[PDB]
């Protein structure tokens, strides 16, 4: 099975582009990463940086996540990022999303040894 590091590269990372290129971006993202295959995710975040920047998170700011866990991270930097937020005309299995670029502080939750991110919590 898919590890939790693993599926938070699958559905986060994308160091490929340094921004969202078009409107076009998260339709396209969202269905070549399987993240659309059982239903619509409502809302997503990829992270335009290098996976060992991103990685590095886990040893930056330690702060609670937004359901009050304790192993949330937040970037000393903030990252190219982009949301994706499904759109009032997005219907399974046409899911469609409004793409919004961004540069923000990235907070996520680490587990494991090694100690890497697995749960993408906020940007702020």
Same mark, same amino acid.
């Given at each position: 099975?898919?590890?939790? %590091?693993?599926?938070?590269?699958?559905?986060?990372?994308? &160091?490929?582009?340094?921004?969202?290129?078009?409107?076009?971006?998260?339709? =396209?993202? $969202?269905?070549?990463?399987?993240?659309?295959? +059982?239903?619509?995710?409502?809302?997503? *975040? !990829?992270?335009?940086?290098?996976?060992?920047?991103?990685?590095?998170?886990?040893? =930056?700011?330690?702060?609670?996540?937004?359901?009050?866990?304790?192993?949330?991270?937040?970037?000393?930097? *903030? $990252?190219?990022?982009? +949301?994706?937020?499904?759109?009032? &005309?997005?219907?399974?299995?046409?899911? %469609?999303?409004?793409? *919004?670029?961004?540069?923000?502080?990235?907070?996520?939750?680490?587990?494991?040894?090694?100690?890497?991110?697995?749960? !993408? +919590?906020? &940007?702020?």
């Amino acid at each position: 099975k898919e590890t939790a %590091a693993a599926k938070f590269e699958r559905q986060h990372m994308d &160091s490929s582009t340094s921004a969202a290129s078009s409107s076009n971006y998260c339709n =396209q993202m $969202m269905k070549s990463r399987n993240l659309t295959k +059982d239903r619509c995710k409502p809302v997503n *975040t !990829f992270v335009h940086e290098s996976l060992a920047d991103v990685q590095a998170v886990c040893s =930056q700011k330690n702060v609670a996540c937004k359901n009050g866990q304790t192993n949330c991270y937040q970037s000393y930097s *903030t $990252m190219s990022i982009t +949301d994706c937020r499904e759109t009032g &005309s997005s219907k399974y299995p046409n899911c %469609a999303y409004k793409t *919004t670029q961004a540069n923000k502080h990235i907070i996520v939750a680490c587990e494991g040894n090694p100690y890497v991110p697995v749960h !993408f +919590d906020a &940007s702020v």
